[PDB]
Amino acid sequence: PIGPEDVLGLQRITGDYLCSPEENIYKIDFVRFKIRDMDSGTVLFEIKKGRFVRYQFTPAFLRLRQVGATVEFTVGDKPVNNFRMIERHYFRNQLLKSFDFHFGFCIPSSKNTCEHIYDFPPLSEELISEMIRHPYETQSDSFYFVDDRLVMHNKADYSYSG
């Protein structure tokens, strides 16, 4: 049984998913995801209607300071309390940054909306160059908890070449 404290100290991407789809007993289902630059309002990525997503971004992405993510999700009939996401980004298994977001109150049996603010870590010129040169070696784990219990785990990797 996996809790926040089990992921909050991880120094590498996991080799596998830490939970199965079945453990999502609350039937949480993301139906919209949109990321924008908070300094320009430019929409960097959007999808409407999936445990793994591969992102193709540009070099300029790595110069962003603050991005806003908007997420829409439905929930099943069981109450969802203390819905929390811990998302850890790594380059070649060096931690870049971990983000810890607590969702607001989730209405059962309905569509919910949330905005998460990511403040980018400072990236050295060397690191930016390497990240551009090494697509898909930037990787993230997204751990989702309800009442301190892991119920979803999504993965992603990132290119900054295109």
Numbering used by the authors: 59 to 107, 126 to 238
What do the study authors state?
UNC119 is a myristoyl binding protein that plays a significant role in maintaining myristoylated proteins in the primary cilium through cycles of solubilising myristoylated proteins and release at the primary cilia by the release factor ARL3GTP, which is specifically activated by ARL13B in the primary cilium. Interestingly, T cells lack primary cilium, but recently, it was reported, in Jurkat cells, that UNC119 plays an important role in shuttling LCK to the plasma membrane and specifically to the IS with UNC119 being proposed to activate RAB11 to traffic LCK-containing endosomes to the IS. LCK undergoes co- and post-translational modifications including N-myristoylation and palmitoylation, which are essential for the localisation of LCK on plasma membranes and RAB11-positive endosomes. Here, we demonstrate a direct role of the ciliary protein UNC119 in trafficking LCK to the immunological synapse.
We sought to confirm the mechanism of action of UNC119i by successfully determining the cocrystal structure of UNC119 with UNC119i to 2.21 Å resolution. The structure confirmed the binding mode of squarunkin A (blue) and its mode of action, which is indeed a direct competitor for the UNC119 myristoyl binding pocket (grey surface). Thus, Unc119i provides a means to competitively inhibit LCK binding to Unc119 and could be used to determine whether the steady-state distribution of LCK in CD8+ T cells relies on Unc119 function. Before sparse matrix screening, the protein was incubated with a twofold molar excess of squarunkin. (A) Structure of UNC119 inhibitor, Squarunkin A. Crystals were obtained in the JBS Kinase screen in a condition containing 30% wt/vol PEG3350, 100 mM Sodium acetate, pH 4.6, and 200 mM ammonium acetate. N-myristoylated LCK peptide is shown in purple stick representation and UNC119i in yellow stick representation. Cross section of UNC119 is shown in green in cartoon and surface form. Critically, this work also highlights that despite squarunkin A only binding to the lipid binding cleft in UNC119, this was sufficient to prevent LCK localisation. This, and previously published work in Jurkat cells, suggests that the major mechanism by which UNC119 acts is by solubilising LCK and trafficking it to the IS as opposed to through activating RAB11-dependent endosomal traffic.
